[PDB]
Amino acid sequence: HWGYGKHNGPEHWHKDFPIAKGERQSPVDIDTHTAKYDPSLKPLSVSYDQATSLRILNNGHAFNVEFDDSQDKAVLKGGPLDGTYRLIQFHFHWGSLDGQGSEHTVDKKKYAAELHLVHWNTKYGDFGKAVQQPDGLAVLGIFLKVGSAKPGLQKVVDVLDSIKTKGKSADFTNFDPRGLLPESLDYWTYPGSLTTPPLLECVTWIVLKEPISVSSEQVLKFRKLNFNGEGEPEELMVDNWRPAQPLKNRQIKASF
Numbered sequence: 194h195w196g197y198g199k200h201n202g203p204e205h206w207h208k209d210f211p212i213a214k215g216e217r218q219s220p221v222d223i224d225t226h227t228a229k230y231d232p233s234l235k236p237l238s239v240s241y242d243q244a245t246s247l248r249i250l251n252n253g254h255a256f257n258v259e260f261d262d263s264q265d266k267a268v269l270k271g272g273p274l275d276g277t278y279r280l281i282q283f284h285f286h287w288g289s290l291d292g293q294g295s296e297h298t299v300d301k302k303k304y305a306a307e308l309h310l311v312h313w314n315t316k317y318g319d320f321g322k323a324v325q326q327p328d329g330l331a332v333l334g335i336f337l338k339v340g341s342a343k344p345g346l347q348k349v350v351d352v353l354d355s356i357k358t359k360g361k362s363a364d365f366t367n368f369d370p371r372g373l374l375p376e377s378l379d380y381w382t383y384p385g386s387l388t389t390p391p392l393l394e395c396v397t398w399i400v401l402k403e404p405i406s407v408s409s410e411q412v413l414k415f416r417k418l419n420f421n422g423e424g425e426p427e428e429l430m431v432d433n434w435r436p437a438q439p440l441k442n443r444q445i446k447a448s449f
């Protein structure tokens with residue numbers, strides 16, 4: 194199956210998922226000089242005060258912190274969005290080195306990692322139906338650079354020991370995602386896709402301009418995770434990022 198190795202990595206995905214060469218694939222390089230300020234964009238609204246996290250899972254390609262999305266508790270709205278999108282999970286993509294790891298790039302610059310807060314359009318009833326719609330998901334992307342530690346991320350870093358291998362999960366209640374947000378909500382937005390198979394073209398991407406900083410020790414712990422399951426040969430979970438894809442017929446808009 195698909196992965197990030199030499200024989201099943203991003204350049205191989207198109208064989209099982211033809212949409213990999215589609216018209217609105219993600220991630221993309223964000224050319225800051227070509228992105229245009231869009232005055233029609235409404236302010237972004239991130240309401241995570243009532244967010245209810247439940248568990249953290251190592252799924253073989255990243256670790257997801259999952260939330261209870263059976264009620265409107267943590268929602269994203271505004272910005273380029275019409276309607277309300279509910280937070281279902283967040284995960285990261287990172288590298289083997291601080292010089293790479295992000296999926297989106299800024300003027301070709303690669304960050305050490307990238308956080309994806311995934312939300313689905315409540316008008317479609319559930320995540321499974323939303324991914325079958327062009328405007329089914331809204332994903333907030335946040336870059337990570339190495340420098341000072343991010344206090345709000347430590348709880349995540351500390352539990353990784355308990356989900357080292359694929360298929361392992363652990364209770365992860367009362368985690369506040371507001372602790373992973375940068376100060377400014379200025380962003381770039383464009384229509385795209387999931388960056389992992391099935392690569393469905395159902396995402397309105399909202400990528401924040403301001404990165405958050407995490408410590409060398411924090412990202413170091415990410416790199417100790419495994420792509421493999423327990424009892425299998427150990428392959429470190431690193432470089433689980435898809436590279437930039439052709440922008441094709443799309444315009445990236447800036448909120449600033």
Ligand SMILES: OCc1ccccc1
Nearest residue numbers: 311332386387388389
């Ligand atoms: O890349 C965004 C994404 C969201 C949900 C599931 C997979 C991928």
Ligand SMILES: [Zn+2]
Nearest residue numbers: 284286309388
């Ligand atoms: Zn992702």
